[PDB]
């Protein structure tokens, strides 16, 4: 199946309270493997998975110098964007950056992406073709011209088609036991009498990986959106994910309702039915 390596960067200004917060996080698929935090003891890039710990001091020195370079760019960006939008120095602002590459089952290049946000909103994003930019507003147009002058699109295309996929493959090999596993959802259903007229059926998917999952309810084989609740997929904290879907049903009608579970790790889609 498909794979991804993604890096996530957040910078927050602290008016009248000194240097801005900077946090960097690296993921292969749904697994965190690296972190940097400006508020932490080490002032170094730190490992967060077993299979990255085995990299030499050259890797950690390299990643530390680079994440600090990212930190310095975001520190400048906060000052620049305060100016571009003429905002007061009284208010906290946020810069976010996300980039990475997808590979197909053959571990070859599929797409790259580089996205940048100011205060929770698209600022500038690289297009599918990796040669041209979408700017959100007139201030991002200033950035877009600066980035076209410096040929930033060409530079990122080269990282995303080259270094990005080549280190993704390495990480997949070194982390074979973790990253190349699929854990099927363990499933069960629960039942809560709610009145003399209704009951909740809750369909559970536990201990699954990766995160991507579909839980659907049917009533007599017909897709049922009405009277359903679907919670966001949530970390269990052990590298696995959890989700549930519930439906409120008339008293006595429980057996009319089926829960359908689709996951990469299920050879076949599961059908569950309430069994008392």
């Amino acid at each position: 199946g498909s794979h991804s390596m993604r890096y996530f960067f957040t910078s927050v200004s602290r008016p009248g309270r000194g240097e801005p917060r900077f946090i960097a996080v690296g993921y292969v698929d749904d697994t965190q493997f690296v972190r940097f935090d400006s508020d932490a003891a080490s002032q170094r890039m730190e490992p967060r998975a077993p299979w990255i710990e085995q990299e030499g001091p050259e890797y950690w020195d390299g990643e530390t110098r680079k994440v600090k370079a990212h930190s310095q760019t975001h520190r400048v960006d906060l000052g620049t964007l305060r100016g571009y939008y003429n905002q007061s120095e009284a208010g906290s602002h946020t810069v976010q950056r996300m980039y990475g590459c997808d590979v197909g089952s053959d571990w070859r290049f599929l797409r790259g992406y580089h996205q940048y946000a100011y205060d929770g909103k698209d600022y500038i994003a690289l297009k599918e073709d990796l040669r041209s930019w979408t700017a959100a507003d007139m201030a991002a147009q200033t950035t877009k011209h600066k980035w076209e002058a410096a040929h930033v699109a060409e530079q990122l295309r080269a990282y995303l088609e080259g270094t990005c996929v080549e280190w993704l493959r390495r990480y997949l090999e070194n982390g074979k036991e973790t990253l190349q596993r699929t854990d099927a959802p363990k499933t069960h259903m629960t039942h809560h009498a709610v009145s003399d007229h209704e009951a909740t059926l809750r369909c559970w998917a536990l201990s699954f990986y990766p995160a991507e999952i579909t839980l659907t309810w049917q009533r007599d084989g017909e897709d049922q959106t009405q009277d359903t609740e679907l919670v966001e997929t949530r970390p269990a904290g052990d590298g696995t994910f959890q989700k549930w879907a519930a439906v409120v049903v008339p008293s006595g009608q429980e057996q009319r309702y089926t829960c359908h579970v689709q996951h990469e790790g299920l050879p076949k889609p599961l059908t569950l039915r309430w069994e008392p």
Binding site: Y84, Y116, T163, C164
Partner: peptide
């Protein structure tokens, strides 16, 4: 592995 490419300021 972070890029050392294509990381320009705003």
């Amino acid at each position: 592995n972070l890029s050392a490419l294509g990381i320009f300021s705003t």
